[PDB]
């Protein structure tokens, strides 16, 4: 059983994005960070839902002695794609990539085609000053850029009565070439017979004040507040009183209008289409069409065509073309003769009555 | 009209805003241009009315704040922008930069240089602390604290009385040491 309460993260989850030394510098980085003052899903423990894992995850928890063993990573968590496990035992870690099947609870039942076992000093350090009130809060940040799993951690000593507001950096612990994709992320539990904070990272532009000895004192964003923006763009932590110029304010156009002339200039298409005495095929009437706007809707609405094939142009693409001249040859003809009329055809009509040239740029219309 | 729109008037393509017009296009005239060859007015090809063109929304955002040692309160400025536009055009834009802001704190104080979205206007004569432009100066003052905007004051008002037979002569004297740095 678990709950999904929401809490504020304050300023929390800033690490060393690099490995380099800086003293009294105000270096600015653009890396994956947990946004300041972003809500984080606070869980509870008394089954172990599978949380996403996208561009990393911030993990933090507080427990009295031990309730958390490790985390399971990978995709589909089964014997079809490679997996990962960070189970932390008494005094060692069991980092390995494998193809674990399923446990639902002595945690995996398959080790097929898998390697890269790793063992080092334990991740979870527990120290008590002869009292249980000292409940250390352990934070972790995982991410999977170009493989190369990275884990950062620091166990703050601040009681654990509430989520601290003070600043605590994150020192890297391990960096290993895992080499497999990770999308889902679970957690394991313990057995001896107010924790489980989770946040998600997104790319952001921070500003970190490196101390003299390389520690991090304080950091600000430039995606949170106007003050934070000016403080980031005027790189410094103290902004003197005055006016400052940060960026430019634009507005894109909302709607696009086009306006072409009032022209109607209706072609004599109606006259031919609403004609009665259509001349025969042996005397095909050729009507010259010029100095007019060739609207094809008047053609569409006047005849329920049975053959509207086109050769040199697209039947849909006729509104957006301008033609030097248009010729309309109209004749009443039989049924099969309609399909007989086409470029590169033959017959008693295509050879003796009306022949369509091979290089024809136009369309034919046939309606009963 | 009166909105940042995209236009494709009779073959002329660009971005701008339009309204009614009051000059005297000749009947054969169709188009608009200027000394440095920029298209201004396009006759409506379906109304024979004149409409004109303006660059979409150009502006520059500036942040006026007291020292961070004093307060985190800030007031934002948008140079030379009518501030119905900033407010209605907040939606459907980028949000991290190109500031979003929800105009709450006695906003749209439209000045002669822009508008302070986050500052309250007032009629007083304090000295200038943070010059703004067009004779406006903002200042952090206790209300219980907020950023106010007010017109410049050129100094404490004074008036000697020039009288045909009035002379004032100092009876005591002081010594002062200033400082000049070059």
């Amino acid at each position, epitope marked *: 059983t678990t709950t999904q309460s929401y809490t504020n993260s304050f300023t929390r989850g800033v690490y060393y994005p690099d490995k380099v030394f800086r003293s009294s510098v105000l270096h600015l980085t653009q890396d994956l960070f947990l946004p300041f*003052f*972003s809500n984080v899903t606070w869980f509870h423990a008394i089954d172990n839902p599978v949380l996403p*894992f996208n561009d990393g995850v911030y993990f933090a928890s507080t427990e009295k002695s031990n309730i958390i063993r490790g985390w399971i990573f990978g995709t589909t968590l089964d014997s079809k*794609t490679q997996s990962l496990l960070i189970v932390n035992n008494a005094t060692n870690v069991f980092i390995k990539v494998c193809e674990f099947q399923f446990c639902n609870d002595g945690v995996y039942s398959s080790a097929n085609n898998c390697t890269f076992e790793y063992v080092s000093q334990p991740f979870l350090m527990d120290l008590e000053g002869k009292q249980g009130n000292f409940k250390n809060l352990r934070e972790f940040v995982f991410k999977n850029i170009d493989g190369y799993f990275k884990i950062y951690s620091k166990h703050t000593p601040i009681i654990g009565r509430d989520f601290p507001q003070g600043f605590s950096a994150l020192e890297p612990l391990v960096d290993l070439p895992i080499g497999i*994709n990770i999308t889902r992320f679970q957690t394991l539990l313990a057995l001896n017979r107010a924790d489980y904070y989770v946040g998600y990272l*997104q790319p952001r532009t921070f500003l970190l004040k490196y101390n003299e000895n390389g520690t991090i004192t304080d950091a600000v964003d430039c995606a*949170l507040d106007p003050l934070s923006e000016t403080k980031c763009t005027l790189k410094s932590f103290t902004v003197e009183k005055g006016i400052y110029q940060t960026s430019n304010f634009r507005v894109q156009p909302t*709607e696009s209008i086009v306006r072409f002339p009032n022209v109607t200039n209706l072609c004599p298409f109606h006259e031919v289409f609403n004609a009665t005495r259509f001349a025969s095929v042996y005397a095909w009437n050729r009507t010259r069409i010029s100095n007019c706007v060739a609207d094809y809707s008047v053609l569409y609405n006047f005849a329920p065509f049975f053959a509207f094939k086109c050769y040199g142009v697209s039947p849909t693409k006729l509104n957006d073309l301008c033609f030097t001249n248009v010729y309309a040859d109209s004749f009443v003809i039989k049924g099969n003769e309609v399909s007989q009329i086409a470029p590169g055809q033959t017959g008693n009509i295509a050879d003796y009555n009306y022949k369509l040239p091979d290089d024809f740029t136009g369309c034919v219309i046939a309606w009963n | 009209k009166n909105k940042c729109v995209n236009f494709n008037f009779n073959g002329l393509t660009g971005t701008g805003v339009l309204t009614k017009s009051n000059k005297k296009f000749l009947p054969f005239q169709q188009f608009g241009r200027d000394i440095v060859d920029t298209t201004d007015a396009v006759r409506d090809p379906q109304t024979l009315e004149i409409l004109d063109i303006t660059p979409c929304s150009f502006g520059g955002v500036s942040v006026i704040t007291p020292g961070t040692n004093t307060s985190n309160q800030v007031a934002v400025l948008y140079q030379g922008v009518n501030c119905t536009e900033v407010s209605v055009a907040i939606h459907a834009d980028q*949000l991290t930069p190109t500031w*979003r802001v929800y105009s709450t704190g006695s906003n749209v104080f439209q000045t002669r240089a822009g508008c302070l979205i986050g500052a309250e206007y007032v009629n007083n004569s304090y000295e200038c602390d943070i010059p703004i432009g067009a004779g406006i100066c903002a200042s952090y003052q206790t209300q219980s604290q907020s950023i106010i905007a007010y017109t410049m004051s050129l100094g404490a008002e004074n008036s000697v009385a020039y009288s045909n037979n009035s002379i004032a002569i100092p009876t005591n004297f002081t010594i002062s040491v200033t400082t000049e740095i070059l």
Partner: antibody
Amino acid sequence: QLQLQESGPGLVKPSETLSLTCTVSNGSISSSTFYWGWVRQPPGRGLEWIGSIYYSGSTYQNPSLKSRAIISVDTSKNQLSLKLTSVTAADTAVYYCARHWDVVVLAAARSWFDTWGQGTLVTVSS
Amino acid sequence: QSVLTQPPSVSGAPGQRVTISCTGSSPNIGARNDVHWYQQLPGAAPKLLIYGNSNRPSGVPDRFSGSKSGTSASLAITGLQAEDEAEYYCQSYDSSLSGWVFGGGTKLTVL
């Protein structure tokens, strides 16, 4: 091609459990590569994601409707099951079974819904 | 629960350009998250048009072009036809809610 057939009582009295179920044809719900989910859309409003569920039993789920929506899956009969409790007048909507959130390569932020059901118009009345 | 903002309605002449925009808050959907676009004919299931902010599935016309910059995302329609009138939806993933979200739905009307 992948088809979804979901059914349920289109009329339910206020305040008890509401239950629908989707069917997958020309495919298998045991397919590990993709997820499966339920999307509801009240009339005159926008789409709303009510939860997604994997074949094993892991469940995506919207925190706003945490205490009322239970989603279950079975691989034997290829059936996607959705339950909703404490239904009130605000839950009148049309429900869809959806397939999305590829696990092998895409991440949880680039996931897009791909397969949609025909929809069942479900209302609550007294 | 509408973290993505959409214009209630829009209209235009057939065969013209219309732009549909979708943006979200800052601590919510971020730069990495991508925005997909769904079309819903009345009384029908929503249909996908663009995913990955620049890619379309098989059968989707090349006329529908979209783009995402920073947080704001938008579509561009060329050669508007009478069949394009529908309910359009923008959707992406909200990292603060750990779950997907949908836009309010914009009304595209052909004039």
